[PDB]
Curated annotation (Swiss-Prot), chain B:
Name listed for the protein in its UniProt record: Protein transport protein SBH1
Organism: Saccharomyces cerevisiae (strain ATCC 204508 / S288c)
Subunit structure: Component of the heterotrimeric Sec61 complex, which is composed of SSH1, SBH1 and SSS1. Presumably three to four Sec61 heterotrimers assemble into an oligomeric ring with a central aqueous pore. In cotranslational ER import, the pore diameter varies from 9-15 A in a ribosome-free resting state to 40-60 A in a functional state when associated with the ribosome. The Sec61 complex is part of a channel-forming translocon complex whose composition seem to change dependent upon different functional states.
Localisation: Endoplasmic reticulum membrane
The organism's place on the tree of life at top rank: Eukaryota
Job of this protein: Part of the Sec61 complex, which is the major component of a channel-forming translocon complex that mediates protein translocation across the endoplasmic reticulum (ER). The functional states of the translocon complex include co- and post-translational ER import, cotranslational membrane protein integration and retrograde transport of misfolded proteins out of the ER. In the cotranslational pathway, ribosomes synthesizing presecretory proteins are targeted to the translocon by the cytosolic signal recognition particle (SRP) and its ER-localized receptor.
Gene it is expressed from: SBH1
Family: Belongs to the SEC61-beta family.
Portion held of the full protein: 51 to 82 of 82
Transmembrane domains' residue ranges: 4-24
UniProtKB/Swiss-Prot annotation, chain C:
GO biological process entries: filamentous growth; post-translational protein targeting to membrane, translocation
The protein, known as: Translocation protein SEC66
Record's subcellular location: Endoplasmic reticulum membrane
Record keyword Cytoplasm present: no
Family as reported in the entry's similarity comment: To S.pombe SpBC409.21.
Subunit structure: Component of the heterotetrameric Sec62/63complex composed of SEC62, SEC63, SEC66 and SEC72. The Sec62/63 complex associates with the Sec61 complex to form the Sec complex. Part of a complex consisting of KAR2, SEC63, SEC66 and SEC72.
Further comment: Present with 7820 molecules/cell in log phase SD medium.
First-to-last residue of the parent protein present: 69 to 206 of 206
Gene Ontology cellular component terms for the protein in this record: cell periphery; endoplasmic reticulum; endoplasmic reticulum membrane; rough endoplasmic reticulum membrane; Sec62/Sec63 complex; translocon complex
Residue runs in coiled coils: none
Species the sequence originates in: Saccharomyces cerevisiae (strain ATCC 204508 / S288c)
Swiss-Prot record, chain D:
UniProt superkingdom: Eukaryota
Signal peptide range: none
Alphabetized SUPFAM superfamilies for the sequence: Preprotein translocase SecY subunit (SSF103491)
Biological source species: Saccharomyces cerevisiae (strain ATCC 204508 / S288c)
GO CC list: endoplasmic reticulum; rough endoplasmic reticulum membrane; Sec61 translocon complex; translocon complex
Other remarks in the entry: Present with 24800 molecules/cell in log phase SD medium.
Quaternary assembly: Component of the heterotrimeric Sec61 complex, which is composed of SEC61, SBH1 and SSS1. Presumably three to four Sec61 heterotrimers assemble into an oligomeric ring with a central aqueous pore. In cotranslational ER import, the pore diameter varies from 9-15 A in a ribosome-free resting state to 40-60 A in a functional state when associated with the ribosome. The Sec61 complex is part of a channel-forming translocon complex whose composition seem to change dependent upon different functional states.
Official protein name in the record: Protein transport protein SEC61
Curated annotation (Swiss-Prot), chain F:
Biological process per Gene Ontology, one example term: post-translational protein targeting to membrane, translocation
Protein's name according to its UniProt entry: Translocation protein SEC72
SMART domains: TPR
UniProt subunit comment: Component of the heterotetrameric Sec62/63complex composed of SEC62, SEC63, SEC71 and SEC72. The Sec62/63 complex associates with the Sec61 complex to form the Sec complex. May interact with protein YLR301W. Part of a complex consisting of KAR2, SEC63, SEC66 and SEC72.
Length: 485, 32, 138, 440, 55, 190
């Protein structure tokens, strides 16, 4: 039919009243109704440079206004005074027949012609151009083309991976003036702890961005079933996060306050943390050449808190989908070796329930996260990570995508059990504070991703679990599955 | 052969043409 | 990254400078070996490429580019064989076997030649102190 | 078998995530809703069919989804009569069936277009007629391509049920928050429940005086109907979780233990749809014959219309109950109507579970093909056990559907129970699909 | 009288959902229904003055 | 660009800087040309040469006889010269299944000789080349792990002996090498 607009402004006030009430009510009701120790969260910012701090720093009133408007309209309504059918609308008269009659239709047609299509096209292009992994399409194409025409003769090094990363297309959008050679030079300066002078803000950006690029490159390398490239990628990620060139004696060079010109000149036999902890406490400082107890305590505490891995039990499992399970023993570089026989074996056993048998990874997903890493030179703050990869032993080719685990308990590294030192050498296993049920043992479950071979016999495998932030000792074991039917 | 953005653009052009014809026929009677 | 245009350049130079004849046949054999190597590479890489494409982490246009290059390589090899028959009559049945042998032969030769450069890489990476005779002096 | 060169949208080669599919469904629904609001240019029935076909007169969507639904039902009948003899072993046959569906939908569109432009009340007097025909033709093509796109994989599911649920939810929201006003003697009155409620609460400032009147609203929808509607909504929601699960295990590969669920509303959509369709057709035919034929023995026996409503006849018993008043006046009529609707929905559920190819024998054959077997039962008894659960489940589901529908029709909710249950089952299917798939 | 007995036995054999999943189910379905209904209501409301001014 | 020699008929790129792939293709073409010059028959057969193989055998025997004479220095030089001649003066279009095994046989003896002499880096590189070119035998893992232990790389030594045991678990020397590597690594860390 034909309605009649409100010219007395008597009908729209209650409409706006209920419209604002229905939105304020539930929001106000909702507003009314509304595990893993970390020791580096304080020490990281203690050694971070000022420029990096500045870079990281640079890089509800709706309720009250609704209540105010509600009060205003309520008072305005209270100030007001006030057989055939007469249809009418609540919309006022001026908004439809006043001087602003074409304004509504022109803004409507504008919003429907230029606002919606342009925005939806931009959003669609942005969501389509990017890969599912989280990188650009051009970078993925470049990585694939590079791995395609790769001579097996050339041995993989860090400089080769840096040169490959220097062609990242997502770096061009950040700085359309720079060149790939400039990116390579910047990354070399960062690894060698050199100053860019003026392009520090760009070096920090590209360093922060290389992370997802390296993960994508690792994924593609595991796709092409090439092991050396993946191992070199892991090493490059380590070198980047630690800001140090790859050397044989690097597990000690990753320390906060060391002088290479003194250390390398003095000794030539210290290459791991165990060999260093073999020495005395003052001997460590005299060797490192820092001669500052107030700072020696800091470097000792940071060096005695990085995790070392060690296997306890590894075996196959043959459900409908075969998957391996791991028993890892996270220990520090200072605690001595404990025999595996002392384990009560109860933590090794698994409860067999319907829910646990349905999804074994449920208990694994219960372990706490890993704390923040100690990156005195990385721009942003990162957590620890552990990526595992499995390959064959007959030919030496990767057989599946890499799995990256993040949930783990670092309880055995806390400063509570400091009596368990290596230099004591008094059989601390028979100690009054020795409680074999206090040491927690995490678990790791790795699916095979491929069905078991239909043949019968022994088939060897090899799983590696490398670090991503530190240069600790990792695992390299070979296991064989005995299909017997 | 046919992309979704093409379909959306066709629909937008259709509704735009209809409303343009409507407003043109209204203003033609209003002015003359 | 190919020696295809190199054959055409050599042909154009021979058309004017009167170079020897066997160099043309040699360059043709080299181009054929490169083409057959590329074809075998594509044949052996197709399954993993298709797997990664189905996984949804490679994009879309690269798949079509690969499918196109698949037949582009075949067309180039056919043109090369036609040019070979044009240069030498009744020399096709032996051409395939000669190509198949020289491909592997030069691949092995390059892989062996690379060790001279490969050697010092590990030296620089491990900071070894090596005197003459290849022995270690710590 | 023939050749055709027509536009068609391409399906994605890879899986579309949840976010993009949600965005596409939303924008498609928005465009479909905008199309149904624009009136024609050159211009100067039963509400039941207009609501069921998701269409309204006087706009670009006067046709609605009628051509698509008619083509789909036609090819359903052609597949049921086994005339196309379609073989699943070939994809060319499916492509030919799809191209035939498109070419028949377009010609049915143009035929209905010429029919309505020559029959409609717009008038006989030419270029205006041509442009008016072309406009609605292009609109039909656009909505057809939109449905095809939403079904290709860019959408959560089909588009017809989505549009129907959209129209139902819109009718429900409009019957509750009608901003319009009507002044008839007493004063300007809202047609929505909450709007008029807050209006009488504010302008009168008398709690006891205004509340007793705003809660009853003998002539217009009130808050009580809204409460009954949300109550039956939560009720049918709670009725969705009811499902029978039996233990199953595989025999081809060991270590495969699973659970097969059997819902209560197995094919809930079909029996209520059949009942509504037959009732609407019966009412239309009876009204037509009573308008054409003045008075005849059989015409009076099958149905007589009065104050219009049917009374004292066969069609008098098929009419749904209005409220508790007519319920308490004629209990025999209410009882016979309840028995009729229950029997109809039950037999419809039975025949549909028989004809759809989901019989206990069919699922037993499917299990034997897959090799699945019960954990604590033998192999030769799977069909015997299914015979004791599947038909009873279907009959009970149909019975509860009929009970919910008659209860909604009696309590006087905001809308008819059939549309509400259709929307709820559509939303529940979408939600369970999104949950089983895995995504935010 | 056997039909209601079979129905009672069957419903006793079905699985009634508890609150922990019922809340998620009702939340999802209510969010969907409200999201479609508000859009429909706004679209029908805004088009009325536009249709009046245009035509 | 590129210049053409007249008397030598050897193609050389006259540019100052060129790509490495271009250099490899140029060298390959030059080798092909100098082989086709020596080969006079129009349609050469994939059958290998005879006098060349005989000279290779003679040089190899002259190098081997130094071991009977207990001369450990000149034998390595003679074997290296024989391998160089066999690699250079052999036509590319010869049979692969005959050029591979002779090279493997000579390379194994050369590896053993340089390992006995006391050279480790060259022996390690040759072992890696032989393992990468498509020969997997438990007889090379022993020497590779021994060389790695001699040049103090414990992780790769452990990986190598583990892979070797993953193919010949019944060996008695691989297990001794594994024990020695485990002890050396325990000292390296602890």
């Amino acid at each position: 039919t034909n309605y009649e607009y409100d010219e007395a402004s008597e009908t729209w006030p209650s409409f706006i009243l209920t419209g604002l009430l229905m939105v304020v009510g539930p929001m106000t009701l909702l507003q009314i109704y509304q595990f893993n120790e970390e020791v580096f969260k304080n020490l990281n910012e203690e050694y971070t440079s000022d420029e990096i701090k500045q870079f990281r720093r640079k890089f509800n009133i709706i309720i009250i206004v609704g209540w105010i408007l509600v009060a205003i309209l309520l008072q305005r309504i209270n100030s007001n005074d006030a057989q055939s059918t007469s249809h009418g609308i609540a919309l006022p008269r001026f908004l439809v027949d006043g001087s602003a009659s074409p304004l509504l239709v022109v803004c409507y047609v504008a919003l429907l012609g230029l606002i919606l299509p342009y925005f939806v096209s931009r959003w669609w292009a942005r969501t389509q151009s990017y890969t599912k992994k989280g990188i650009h399409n051009v970078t993925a194409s470049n990585f694939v083309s590079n791995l395609v025409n790769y001579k097996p003769s050339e041995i993989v090094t860090t400089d080769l991976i840096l040169h490959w990363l220097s062609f990242a297309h997502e770096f061009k959008q950040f700085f359309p003036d720079l060149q790939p050679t400039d990116f390579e030079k910047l990354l070399q300066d960062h690894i060698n702890r050199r100053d860019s002078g003026k392009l520090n803000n760009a070096k920090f950006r590209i360093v922060a961005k290389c992370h997802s690029l390296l993960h994508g490159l690792l994924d593609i390398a595991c796709g092409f079933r090439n092991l050396d490239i993946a191992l070199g990628a892991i090493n490059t990620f380590k070198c980047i996060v630690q800001a140090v060139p790859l050397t044989p004696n690097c597990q000690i060079l990753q320390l906060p306050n060391v002088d290479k010109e003194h250390f390398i000149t003095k000794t030539g036999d210290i290459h791991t943390l165990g060999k260093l902890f073999t020495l005395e406490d003052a001997k460590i400082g005299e060797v490192l050449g820092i001669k500052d107890q107030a700072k020696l305590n800091e470097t000792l505490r940071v060096a005695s808190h990085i995790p070392n891995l060690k296997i306890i039990k590894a075996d196959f499992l043959v459900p409908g989908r075969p998957y391996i399970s791991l028993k890892v023993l996270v220990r520090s570089a200072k605690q001595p070796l404990i025999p595996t026989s002392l384990i009560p074996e109860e933590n090794l056993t698994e409860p067999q329930d319907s829910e646990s048998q349905r999804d074994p990874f449920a208990m694994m997903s219960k372990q706490p996260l890993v704390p923040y890493s100690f990156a005195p030179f990385f721009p942003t703050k990162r957590r620890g990570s552990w990526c595992c990869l499995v390959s064959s032993q007959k030919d030496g080719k990767i057989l599946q995508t890499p799995i990256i685990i993040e949930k783990l308990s670092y309880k055995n590294l806390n400063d509570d059990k400091d009596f368990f030192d290596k230099r004591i050498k008094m059989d601390l296993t028979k100690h009054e504070k020795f409680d074999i049920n206090d040491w927690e043992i995490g678990t790791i479950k790795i699916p095979l991703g491929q069905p078991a071979p239909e043949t019968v016999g022994d088939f060897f495998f090899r799983v590696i679990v490398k670090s991503t932030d530190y240069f600790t000792t990792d695992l390299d074991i070979t296991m064989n599955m005995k299909v017997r039917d | 052969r046919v992309d979704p953005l093409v379909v959306l653009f066709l629909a937008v052009g259709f509704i735009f043409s209809v409303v343009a014809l409507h407003v043109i026929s209204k203003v033609a009677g209003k002015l003359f | 990254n190919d020696a295809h245009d190199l054959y055409f350049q050599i042909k154009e130079m021979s058309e004017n400078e009167k170079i020897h004849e066997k160099v043309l046949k040699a360059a043709l054999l080299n181009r054929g070996a490169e083409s057959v190597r590329r074809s075998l590479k594509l044949k052996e890489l197709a399954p993993q490429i298709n797997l990664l494409y189905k996984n949804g982490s490679i994009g879309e246009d690269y798949w079509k580019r690969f499918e196109t290059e698949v037949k582009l390589i075949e067309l180039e090899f056919k043109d090369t064989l036609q040019e070979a028959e044009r240069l030498q009559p009744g020399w096709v049945q032996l051409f395939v076997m000669v190509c198949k042998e020289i491909c592997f032969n030069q691949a092995l030769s390059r892989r062996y030649q690379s060790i001279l450069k490969r050697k010092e890489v590990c030296i620089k990476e491990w900071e070894l102190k090596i005197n003459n005779d290849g022995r270690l002096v710590n | 078998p023939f050749e055709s060169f027509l536009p068609e949208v391409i399906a994605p080669e890879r899986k579309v995530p949840y976010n993009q599919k949600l965005i596409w469904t939303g924008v498609s629904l928005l465009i479909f809703l905008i199309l149904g609001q624009i009136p024609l240019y050159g211009i100067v029935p039963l509400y039941w069919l207009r609501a069921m076909l998701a269409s309204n007169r006087g706009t670009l969507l006067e046709l609605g989804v009628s051509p698509i639904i008619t083509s789909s039902l036609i090819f359903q009948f052609l597949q049921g009569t086994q005339l196309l003899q379609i073989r699943p072993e070939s994809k060319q046959d499916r492509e030919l069936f799809q191209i035939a569906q498109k070419v028949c939908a377009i010609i049915l569109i143009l035929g209905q277009a010429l029919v309505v432009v020559m029959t409609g009340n717009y008038g006989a007097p030419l270029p205006i007629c041509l442009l008016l025909i072309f406009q609605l033709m292009f609109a039909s093509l656009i909505v057809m391509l939109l449905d095809e796109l939403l079904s290709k994989g860019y959408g959560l599911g089909s588009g017809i049920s989505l549009f129907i649920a959209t129209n139902i939810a819109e009718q429900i929201f409009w019957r509750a928050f009608a901003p319009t006003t009507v002044n008839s003697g007493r004063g300007k009155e809202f047609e929505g429940a909450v709007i008029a409620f807050f209006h009488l609460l504010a302008v009168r400032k008398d709690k006891k005086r205004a509340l007793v009147e705003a809660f009853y609203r003998t002539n217009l929808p009130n808050m009580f109907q809204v409460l009954m509607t949300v109550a039956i909504f939560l009720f049918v929601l709670y009725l969705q979780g009811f499902r029978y699960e039996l233990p199953i295990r595989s025999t081809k590969v060991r270590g495969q233990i699973g659970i097969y669920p059997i819902k209560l509303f197995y094919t809930s959509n079909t029996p209520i749809i059949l009942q509504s369709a037959l009732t609407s057709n019966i009412f239309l035919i009876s009204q037509i014959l009573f308008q054409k034929y003045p008075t005849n023995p059989l015409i009076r026996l099958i149905g007589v219309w009065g104050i219009q409503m049917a009374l004292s006849g066969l069609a008098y018993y098929i009419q749904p109950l209005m409220s508790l008043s007519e319920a308490l006046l004629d209990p025999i009529k209410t009882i016979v109507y309840i028995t009729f609707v229950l029997g109809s929905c039950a037999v419809f559920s039975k025949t549909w579970i028989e004809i759809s190819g989901t019989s206990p024998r069919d699922i037993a054959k499917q299990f034997k093909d897959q090799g699945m077997v019960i954990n604590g039962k033998r192999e030769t008894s799977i069909y015997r056990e299914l015979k004791k659960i599947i038909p009873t489940a279907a009959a009970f589901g149909g019975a509860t559907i009929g009970a919910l529908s008659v209860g909604s029709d009696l309590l006087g909710t905001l809308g008819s129970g059939a549309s509400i249950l259709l929307a709820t089952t559509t939303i529940y299917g979408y939600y369970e699909a999104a949950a089983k798939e895995g995504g935010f | 009288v056997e039909f209601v007995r079979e129905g009672t036995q069957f419903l006793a054999k079905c699985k009634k959902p508890d609150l922990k999943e019922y809340t998620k189910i009702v939340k999802a379905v209510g969010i969907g229904f409200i999201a479609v209904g508000i859009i429909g209501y706004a679209i029908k409301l805004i088009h009325i003055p536009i249709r009046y001014v245009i035509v | 660009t590129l210049e053409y020699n007249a008397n030598s008929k050897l193609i050389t790129a006259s540019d100052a800087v060129v790509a490495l792939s271009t250099e490899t293709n140029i060298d390959q073409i030059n080798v092909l040309t100098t082989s086709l010059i020596g080969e006079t028959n129009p349609n050469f057969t994939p059958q290998p040469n005879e006098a060349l193989s005989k000279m290779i055998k003679g040089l190899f025997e002259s190098g081997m006889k130094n071991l009977q004479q207990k001369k450990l220095n000149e034998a390595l030089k003679n074997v290296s010269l024989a391998i160089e001649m066999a690699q250079r003066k052999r036509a590319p279009w010869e049979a692969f299944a005959i050029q591979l095994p002779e090279l493997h046989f000579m390379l194994r003896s050369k590896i053993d000789l340089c390992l006995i002499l006391g050279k480790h880096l060259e022996a390690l590189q040759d072992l890696d080349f032989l393992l990468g070119t498509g020969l997997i035998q438990p007889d090379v893992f022993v020497r590779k792990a021994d060389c790695l232990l001699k040049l103090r790389q414990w992780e790769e030594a452990r990986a190598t002996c583990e892979r070797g045991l993953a193919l010949a678990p019944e060996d008695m020397k691989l297990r001794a090498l594994l024990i020695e590597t485990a002890r050396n690594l325990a000292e390296y860390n602890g």
